[PDB]
Specification:
4-stranded mixed sheet; primary mitochondrial disease
Length: 387
């Protein structure tokens, strides 16, 4: 199918498209259709082409006439995309550099029809990964897209993560600039660097270190903070090669999980690291990752992927995230819950199912290789003590 035609149609529903991209890990790795990955890159960069006066509508509606009055400089071309918004560089009256993430107008009101239209385009493209059927994507995307609209809550999540990561040697969260925040605008101090989804050209040793730190953060989110971002937006993680630090800009749809969920989940990962397939299966059915009735090949998609996670966490040798077989297994975990079930599971169960795999997949994209047993034993030990 013709790429720029698809790009043009996806741009009309860019919020829905990019959010779905985050949820499905649509990226240039060993598994995704390369034409599809390139199309999604084009949609991201096409924030450049989105109407001027749409931005100023949102700024008008949210902090009225006079906002410009706060600024020495407002860059009219965004420097990044963030699904239902785009991020602009500004300089406040005073010189302070900021990053203003501005929502497209009326996204909350066009969610159902936008998700509808997105699935039409993706269905006709014939580029969707195997096992993903549009009708099974609709509901989960509509719900997650509505959550992304809540920039007041995203600001609150950013504040909490900044507190959690205070003093961290690698990660940092820029300060929220309250005077430039509203329901539809989220402003932080500026960050600089490689977006991580563009970091493939860095040295092996630097990619290894970035990704080791990313997977550790994932484990801490799951088992220490109990506060986690489901589908992160790696294009809004910024590596500064000068400081050797990664800035975290996007906290959309961050979730708290109770002890009951996290208890059972860590038992599943422990079982996988102990190479206990039957216990992974049983506890997966308890969790409702599986209903227990899946056809054998789909059951196996789930079990083979979780056991690959366990393989990494059980090995004192470096794990090679970038192999095509590992990349494929982790992607093929995603369709397991995306089917019509007799009993719809809790929304948060869907999100938890995708979380660890998403982190493995940015490691795959960046062709990282590093040992994982120590991070898991640390995380597990730490969790068990508080038990």
């Amino acid at each position: 199918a013709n790429a720029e035609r698809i790009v043009r149609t996806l741009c009309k529903v860019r919020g829905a498209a990019l959010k779905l991209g985050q949820m499905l890990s649509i990226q240039d790795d060993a598994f995704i259709n390369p034409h599809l990955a390139k199309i999604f890159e084009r949609v991201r960069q096409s924030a450049d082409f989105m109407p001027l006066k749409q931005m100023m509508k949102t700024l008008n509606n949210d902090l009225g006439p006079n906002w410009r009055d706060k600024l020495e400089y407002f860059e009219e071309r965004p420097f990044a995309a963030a699904s239902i918004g785009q991020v602009h560089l500004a300089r406040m009256k005073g010189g302070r550099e900021v990053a203003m993430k501005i929502q497209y107008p009326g996204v909350a009101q066009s969610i159902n029809s936008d998700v509808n239209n997105l699935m039409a385009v993706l269905n006709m493209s014939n580029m969707l990964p195997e096992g993903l059927f549009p009708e099974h994507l609709i509901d989960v995307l509509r719900r997650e897209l509505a959550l992304e609209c809540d920039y007041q809550r995203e600001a609150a999540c950013a504040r909490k993560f900044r507190d959690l990561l205070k003093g961290h040697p690698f990660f940092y969260v820029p300060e929220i600039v309250d005077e430039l925040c509203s329901p539809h605008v989220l402003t932080t101090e500026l960050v600089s660097g490689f977006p991580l989804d563009q970091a493939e050209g860095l040295s092996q040793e630097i990619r290894n270190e970035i990704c080791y730190n990313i997977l550790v953060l994932c484990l801490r989110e799951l088992f220490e903070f109990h506060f986690m971002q489901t589908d992160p937006n790696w294009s809004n993680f910024f590596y500064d090669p000068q400081q050797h630090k990664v800035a975290l800009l996007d906290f959309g749809a961050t979730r708290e999980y109770d002890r009951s969920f996290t208890d059972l989940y860590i038992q599943i990962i422990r079982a996988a690291a102990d190479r206990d397939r039957e216990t992974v299966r049983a506890k997966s059915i308890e969790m409702k990752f599986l209903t227990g009735y899946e056809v054998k090949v789909m059951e196996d998609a789930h079990l083979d992927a979780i056991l690959i996670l366990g393989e990494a966490f059980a090995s004192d040798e470096p794990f090679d995230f970038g192999t095509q077989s590992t990349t494929e297994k982790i992607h093929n975990l995603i369709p397991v819950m995306l089917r019509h079930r007799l009993v719809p599971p809790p929304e948060e169960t869907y999100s938890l199912h995708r979380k660890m795999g998403g982190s493995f997949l940015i490691c795959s994209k960046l062709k990282a290789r590093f040992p994982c047993k120590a991070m898991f034993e640390e995380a597990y030990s730490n969790y068990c003590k508080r038990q």
